[PDB]
Every structure is written in structure tokens, then in C-alpha cells.
């Protein structure tokens, strides 16, 4: 319905233990002018988790789309249990950093002519589909980072136990 | 278009400090981070720290902790590095780099201050030093003692000249770049590839991990005519 709620709060590590030097980083799959963000593979159940996945989408160029993939609850039976996902407005609604806690933020407000199209492939913009997409602006004047959170880390399958995806988008300025 | 100028050259006697400015053109300043890295004669790359201009926020390894100090004035687009208790494995050439998303890649470096005073990721390079001739095709590699997924980016340096970048993200061209370059590699083993060397080719060329703190370089692939 596109409002925040200006009380919540998360970290990026969540409830996991493990500090950002820990956290198994890596690059978007950028192909053309679509980067692409899939956590199917990597929040998994595994007996070394909870592991952070943290998936980081780099852009200064103009009319990128960002496409971010997070597997569905019983899309798989078991593996996906517990998933959750933040915020639940995506991408509408996005995390940013202030006074060093994640909170929720418009992201229409963050950058200024941002596409959302409310439908992907005939369904919902959001991640109850499984899917969220949006394509950044021709230009862009303030550096900006902002975060989704796609957290598996409460599912356990015995001694398994899966991950928390972290999507980090960091713009910078182009355009000039 | 993006300019960073710096001070001129500094002979300083051991016991004493140095000041070292970059002023900043062509861009919005505080959006965009300022690292220092510096170079002693006939060595490779050593990263100093960086500085976020919006908020004076710095970041350094434990080799300069306390010996540096980086401080910017927004007014004037200006950063400074003041290094404090200098003895005489600290004459090097001081270069301020702008980082592009934080630490990703340096694309715009500064012109070098040369410093002159008075009497853990290991990035790893094969060859040395190499012998070619126009029209031959080179492959260097480079080698991460950790993975570091895509984030490795390659580096051309001339006598006398700042790290020009050629590749980010383990194979993307930098803009600008003759399309000869490539490169390739993700994890751990990556490889720059020149398909016909052409006459200002002739260079050392470095590798830099960007994946975590601190950044090392390579020691440096030197490229050299017959």
C-alpha cells in the first residue's frame, strides 16, 4: 500500500553471529543492462549455516534494472520453511543505514525518477511472487546505498540450517 | 574532466611530518570516497587508508593506525594525509585515488606526491619481468591467497605516471581502454590478456583485490621491450 513503518528496525547481520567480515560477498551477474541478483542456490539448508550471502549490485550507469530472485516458502518442501523477507513492500519499500541500524525508506523518495513497474510478467512487483525488479533512472546526482533482506536463516533440516541473503544496491553518480 | 591535483615534492628530514593535499574538480566531492596509496622507488602499491568526505569518516590498517591522518575540507573540495614520525622507509611517492563505490575499483587517480626523507590477502604475480615485441600476444596472471570472488581489478603503470585502470570487476573494460585487454577469472586465479601488444603497452602492470580490508596489490608484472 506503499507506507513505512518509521518503527522498524534490523541489522544486516540479523540474528546469525556473524560479523560483516565473515559474510560470503559477491558480485551481482550483470549481463547487458540487467544485474541480477538469484539467492535459489545459495540459501539452502547446509550443516556449516547459518551463512550470510550477501549479493552486492554496483552501478554508475544509466537505465540499469535490478532483478532480485528469493525463493518462496514450500516453492521447494522443506528447504524454505522459515524464509522471510524485508521489507515486505519491496521494492517499493527499501532498507537504508541510519545511525548505524537498517530502517525502512521510500525508494522513490531515495532516487528521484526511478521506474517501478507494478507488474512483472503479469504478476505482482513484490516478493510474495518470488520476484522483485525496478529500473534505476537516466541520472543520478547522490551516491546511495540501500539494502533487501531475503533471510532463510530460522529454517533447520536436522543439523542443516540455511542462510541469510543480503542484496546490497550501491548507486553512485552518473549521468553527465 | 575529474581532476585530482596535489602538492608539490617534499624533502623532509627523519622525526618530522608531511602534509599531503588533493584538491578535487570535475565531480560532486562528497559522494565519493578518497583512499591513499603509496608507492617507494622501484616497489609496488601499498594502500593507506580511506576517507569519506560527507562525514570525515576514515578507515586504516594496522601499518599506518596512528601514523596517518586523514582530514578534507568540503568547502574547497580538498583531502589531506598528514603522516607524523617519518623515518626513511617512508620515501615514496603518495598518491590520493578515488574510489569508486566505497573501495570496488580506483578509476581516478591523482598525479603523486613524492615524499623524500633524509638518513591478510596476499596478491600474487607471475611473471616478474617479461620481453616481447609489437604484435605479441601476453597473458599475466595473478593469484588471491582467498577468494575473492569478481572483485580484482588490473592496473597499467608507466615510469613517472600514475596507476591507470584498465580492468574492474576481474573482466570488465574500463572506458577508455583499448579493447586488446581482457580479462578473466573469478575466485581465486585470474589472468589479463593483451592480444597484440602495441607500442605504449610497454609498462608494469598490477593486480588489486578490492574483496576486503586491508587492499594489496601484486608486486607487479613488468612488461619490456626486446
Known amino acids: 500500500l506503499d507506507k513505512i513503518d518509521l518503527s522498524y528496525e534490523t541489522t544486516e547481520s540479523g540474528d546469525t553471529a556473524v560479523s560483516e567480515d565473515s559474510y560470503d560477498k559477491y558480485a551481482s551477474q550483470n549481463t547487458n543492462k540487467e544485474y541480477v541478483c538469484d539467492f535459489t542456490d545459495q540459501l539452502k539448508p547446509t550443516e556449516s549455516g547459518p551463512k550470510v550471502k550477501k549479493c552486492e549490485v554496483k552501478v554508475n550507469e544509466p537505465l540499469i534494472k535490478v532483478k532480485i530472485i528469493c525463493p518462496l516458502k514450500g516453492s521447494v518442501e522443506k528447504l524454505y520453511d522459515n524464509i522471510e523477507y524485508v521489507p515486505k513492500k519491496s521494492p517499493y519499500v527499501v532498507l537504508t543505514k541510519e545511525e548505524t541500524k537498517l530502517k525502512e525508506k521510500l525508494l522513490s523518495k531515495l532516487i528521484y525518477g526511478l521506474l517501478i513497474s507494478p507488474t512483472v510478467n503479469e504478476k505482482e512487483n513484490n516478493f510474495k511472487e518470488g520476484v522483485i525488479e525496478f529500473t534505476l533512472p537516466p541520472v543520478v546526482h547522490k551516491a546511495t546505498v540501500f539494502y533487501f533482506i531475503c533471510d532463510n536463516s530460522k529454517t533447520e533440516d536436522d543439523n542443516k540450517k540455511g542462510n541469510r541473503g543480503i542484496v546490497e544496491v550501491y548507486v553512485e553518480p552518473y549521468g553527465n | 574532466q575529474v581532476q585530482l591535483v596535489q602538492s608539490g615534492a617534499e624533502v623532509k628530514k627523519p622525526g618530522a611530518s608531511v602534509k599531503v593535499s588533493c584538491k578535487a574538480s570535475?565531480?560532486?566531492?562528497?559522494?565519493?570516497?578518497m583512499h591513499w596509496v603509496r608507492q617507494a622507488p622501484g616497489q609496488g602499491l601499498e594502500w593507506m587508508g580511506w576517507?569519506?568526505?560527507?562525514?570525515?569518516?576514515?578507515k586504516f590498517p594496522q601499518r599506518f593506525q596512528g601514523r596517518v591522518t586523514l582530514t578534507r575540507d568540503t568547502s574547497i573540495s580538498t583531502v589531506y594525509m598528514e603522516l607524523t614520525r617519518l623515518r626513511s622507509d617512508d620515501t615514496a611517492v603518495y598518491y590520493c585515488?578515488?574510489?569508486?563505490?566505497?573501495?570496488?575499483?580506483?578509476?581516478?587517480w591523482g598525479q603523486g606526491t613524492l615524499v623524500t626523507v633524509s638518513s591478510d590477502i596476499q596478491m600474487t604475480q607471475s611473471p616478474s619481468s617479461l620481453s616481447a615485441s609489437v604484435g605479441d600476444r601476453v597473458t599475466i596472471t595473478c593469484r588471491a591467497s582467498?577468494?575473492?570472488?569478481?572483485?580484482l581489478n588490473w592496473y597499467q603503470q608507466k615510469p613517472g605516471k600514475a596507476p591507470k585502470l584498465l580492468i574492474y570487476?576481474?573482466?570488465s573494460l574500463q572506458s577508455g581502454v583499448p579493447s586488446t585487454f581482457s580479462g578473466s577469472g573469478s575466485g581465486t586465479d585470474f589472468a589479463l590478456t593483451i592480444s597484440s601488444l602495441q607500442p605504449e603497452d610497454f609498462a608494469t602492470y598490477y593486480c588489486?583485490?578490492?574483496?576486503?580490508?586491508?587492499?594489496?596489490f601484486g608486486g607487479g608484472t613488468k612488461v619490456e621491450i626486446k
Open positions: 582467498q577468494n575473492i570472488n569478481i572483485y
Open positions: 570535475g565531480y560532486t566531492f562528497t559522494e565519493y570516497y
Open positions: 576517507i569519506n568526505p560527507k562525514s570525515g569518516d576514515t
Open positions: 585515488a578515488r574510489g569508486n563505490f566505497r573501495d570496488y575499483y580506483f578509476a581516478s
Open positions: 588489486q583485490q578490492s574483496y576486503s580490508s586491508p587492499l594489496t
Open positions: 570487476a576481474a573482466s
